[PDB]
Amino acid sequence: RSLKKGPFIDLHLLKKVEKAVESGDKKPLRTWSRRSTIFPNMIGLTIAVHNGRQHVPVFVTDEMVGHKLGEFAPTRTYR
Amino acid sequence: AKQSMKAREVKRVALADKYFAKRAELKAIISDVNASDEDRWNAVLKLQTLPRDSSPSRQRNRCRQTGRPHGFLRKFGLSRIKVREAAMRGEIPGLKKASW
Amino acid sequence: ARIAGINIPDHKHAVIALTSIYGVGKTRSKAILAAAGIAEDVKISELSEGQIDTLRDEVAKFVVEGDLRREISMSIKRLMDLGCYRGLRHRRGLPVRGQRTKTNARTRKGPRK
Amino acid sequence: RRRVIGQRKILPDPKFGSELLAKFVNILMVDGKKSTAESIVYSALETLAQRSGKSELEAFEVALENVRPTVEVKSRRVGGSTYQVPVEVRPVRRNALAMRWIVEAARKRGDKSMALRLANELSDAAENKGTAVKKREDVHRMAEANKAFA
Amino acid sequence: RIRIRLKAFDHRLIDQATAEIVETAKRTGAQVRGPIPLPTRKERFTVLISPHVNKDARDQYEIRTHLRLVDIVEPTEKTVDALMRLDLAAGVDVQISL
RNA sequence: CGGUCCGGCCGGGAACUCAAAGGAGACUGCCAGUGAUAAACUGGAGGAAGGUGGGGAUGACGUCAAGUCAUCAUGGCCCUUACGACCAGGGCUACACACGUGCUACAAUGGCGCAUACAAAGAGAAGCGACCUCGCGAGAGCAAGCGGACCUCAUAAAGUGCGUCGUAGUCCGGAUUGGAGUCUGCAACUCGACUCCAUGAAGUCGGAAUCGCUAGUAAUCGUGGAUCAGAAUGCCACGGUG
């Protein structure tokens, strides 16, 4: 939305570019970032995104190049 | 309303006069207009907007007497929760009972 | 003769059955009428065989109907596969207009008999 | 209450010199847009000019001469009972009654321009030839025949 | 060579403050004109009459902003010096400009 | 009526307007009539105005000992290793359904496009912004006038008039859905506004039943301000038609 070629990353991600396509042998990286965006190449990076109580296992394709981290991390369940 | 609300403006309002009302009119020192599709300024401008609480936004005057935000009226000099008791004491110059 | 309109009414101005329907738009679809010799003010009947060849000349420039609906539908079906906010709201019958389902969601809900 | 009008004065039509044609545009107009009503008056008289046997200068007055009653029926409370009584239709209303019925008829119609909707009723307003149209006058025919109790 | 201003809200204080300025300006200048006017303004506002709810009950307040260009006949160096220390009570606002 | 920054600009005036103050004038004064013949009323003359001239400001005793310690204090109680406050992420615009009210239309006493007549009241220099340029466009970029009574915000709009059109969910509308952008701002994904190429639905009186005032009043169209980094249709005001 609004921006040609999509925005540049947050500075708190600009310091985390060594963990952009790989998390390692460790548990999927716990992320409270929801207003920040994804890296333009990010597949193979295992992450868990906050929902307001817990962290959820999110799924991302190699074709996703600009989305807010909250936009694909659900918060509700019906009744 | 809380006693914490009384000093919440102190840093915010100071940077409003310092930068947050001219930095866009003076932006030509942190900008370039000669290179096509080339960035050398975004990360230093995002570093300038890295600090929080003090913003061009978030800025509210409040009732400094009570911490209450709502019912502020600049034309009265005082938030309406205290206006009648102050204006009938004669404390606000030159508010009086004269009606329509 | 007709070129893009499919409805029954006869002898109208050269815009109502010429523009703003199924994919043809109104921005370039009206400028071609002067080359065909057709006027855009007041009802007209000069569009026939011969005049219409100047309009049948426009090829590969635009798309209409189901192929234009394919363009938007696939551009949402790629998102309905994913955990995206508008993904589930187009996989399930949910609004995206930022609505209050306590008060107004009437287009998305329906009758109200 | 008591210390009230009556009838407030209105200025007569500048072109025709008539106070009936002044009241007529006041009740004809809608949302106070009297400037459009000044284009409907006389424009609705197009098909009446030659047809008026009183000449054009009475081609609208003729539709108001058709009905000039002295009493109307009203249904009024005397206690736990409600009865039909004749009430007087005074000179000030006697000339303005049918005028108020013709504008309602034109507003309730929905074909052509308003200057043609008004002309539909005005064409028969002194002929009364239509079906179930004189039901309009049953409120005065029932008044010249009131019996009540004395 | 300067020009002057007087601004107030009180209908009598505007003349009492004029009578301070045109006298300070006459103490070092013998030629006279008397005060010139303009611009006057007015403003009105409404408030809720009670601090808690009661939003159907309201009270009416207004002000009248008075201003004079005043004019000075001789704005001489010795006369503007007397206006650098202008006092003149609180309750009004003034300017000196060139 | 001379001179002319060609201009109420200088000479001339202090009057009208426009903005401001203080008086005088309306007193049943005047006639006849009515009135337990009295209070005061009922008409006429004369007047700008006639009967507290007209319009405002004002809440007697009493009304539920009303709503509120969520603005306040202030007696008490409970929590204090917290029911306290500092960040951050979700929420206070969940929804198979109810209540509470407006605005714009459903049209042709109406809309649209192009002309054309006339404002009142407010806003404004880290401002109000006239223009031109790039472009599809928001807008960006520069920038006239002006210090806010001879500038900007600003073709008021409706109305008038011409061109055009129907009983068709319409020329219309463009509500909705993606894609592009434009602005402000850690940040507009989610809840923001403005724009463009495209697509495209609802509205042709509307449930039992019922609502409200007496004239510049109802009815109806534009203009302005507040809040404000960045949006209202809500809030407070202004004038036109009536």
Swiss-Prot record, chain A:
The lineage of its organism: Bacteria, Pseudomonadati, Pseudomonadota, Gammaproteobacteria, Enterobacterales. GO terms for biological process: cytoplasmic translation; ribosomal small subunit assembly. InterPro entries: Ribosomal_uS19, Ribosomal_uS19_bac-type, Ribosomal_uS19_CS, Ribosomal_uS19_SF. HAMAP family: Ribosomal_uS19. In the E.coli 70S ribosome in the initiation state it has been modeled to contact the 23S rRNA of the 50S subunit forming part of bridge B1a; this bridge is broken in the model with bound EF-G. The 23S rRNA contact site in bridge B1a is modeled to differ in different ribosomal states, contacting alternately S13 or S19. In the 3.5 angstroms resolved ribosome structures the contacts between L5, S13 and S19 bridge B1b are different, confirming the dynamic nature of this interaction. Bridge B1a is not visible in the crystallized ribosomes due to 23S rRNA disorder. GO terms for molecular function: rRNA binding; structural constituent of ribosome; tRNA binding. It comes from Escherichia coli (strain K12). Keywords: Ribonucleoprotein, Ribosomal protein, RNA-binding, rRNA-binding, tRNA-binding. This is Small ribosomal subunit protein uS19. The gene is rpsS.
From Swiss-Prot, chain B:
Pfam families: Ribosomal_S14 (PF00253). NCBIfam families: PRK08881.1. GO terms for cellular component: cytoplasm; cytosolic small ribosomal subunit; small ribosomal subunit. Keywords: Ribonucleoprotein, Ribosomal protein. Belongs to the universal ribosomal protein uS14 family. One of its GO terms (biological process) is cytoplasmic translation. GO terms for molecular function: rRNA binding; structural constituent of ribosome; tRNA binding. It comes from the Bacteria. Binds 16S rRNA, required for the assembly of 30S particles and may also be responsible for determining the conformation of the 16S rRNA at the A site. Part of the 30S ribosomal subunit. Contacts proteins S3 and S10. Gene3D superfamilies: 1.10.287.1480. This is Small ribosomal subunit protein uS14.
UniProtKB/Swiss-Prot annotation, chain D:
GO terms for biological process: cytoplasmic translation; negative regulation of translation; ribosomal small subunit assembly; translation. One of its GO terms (molecular function) is structural constituent of ribosome. Keywords: Ribonucleoprotein, Ribosomal protein, RNA-binding, rRNA-binding, tRNA-binding. The chain holds residues 3 to 152 of 179 of the full protein. The lineage of its organism: Bacteria, Pseudomonadati, Pseudomonadota, Gammaproteobacteria, Enterobacterales. Belongs to the universal ribosomal protein uS7 family. This is Small ribosomal subunit protein uS7. One of the primary rRNA binding proteins, it binds directly to 16S rRNA where it nucleates assembly of the head domain of the 30S subunit. Is located at the subunit interface close to the decoding center, where it has been shown to contact mRNA. Has been shown to contact tRNA in both the P and E sites; it probably blocks exit of the E site tRNA. Changing M114G: Significantly decreases affinity for its own mRNA. Part of the 30S ribosomal subunit. Contacts proteins S9 and S11. Cross-links to IF3 and the P and E site tRNAs. GO terms for cellular component: cytoplasm; cytosol; cytosolic small ribosomal subunit; membrane; ribosome. The strain K12 sequence is shown.
Swiss-Prot record, chain E:
One of its GO terms (cellular component) is cytosol. One of its GO terms (molecular function) is structural constituent of ribosome. One of its GO terms (biological process) is regulation of DNA-templated transcription elongation. Gene3D superfamilies: Ribosomal protein S10 domain (3.30.70.600). Pfam families: Ribosomal_S10 (PF00338). Keywords: Ribonucleoprotein, Ribosomal protein, Ribosome biogenesis, RNA-binding, Transcription, Transcription antitermination, Transcription regulation. Signal peptide: none annotated. InterPro entries: Ribosomal_uS10, Ribosomal_uS10_CS, Ribosomal_uS10_dom, Ribosomal_uS10_dom_sf. PROSITE patterns: RIBOSOMAL_S10. Involved in the binding of tRNA to the ribosomes. Part of the processive rRNA transcription and antitermination complex (rrnTAC). The complex forms an RNA-chaperone ring around the RNA exit tunnel of RNA polymerase (RNAP). It supports rapid transcription and antitermination of rRNA operons, cotranscriptional rRNA folding, and annealing of distal rRNA regions to allow correct ribosome biogenesis. In complex with NusB is involved in the regulation of ribosomal RNA (rRNA) biosynthesis by transcriptional antitermination. Belongs to the universal ribosomal protein uS10 family. This is Small ribosomal subunit protein uS10. It comes from Escherichia coli (strain K12).
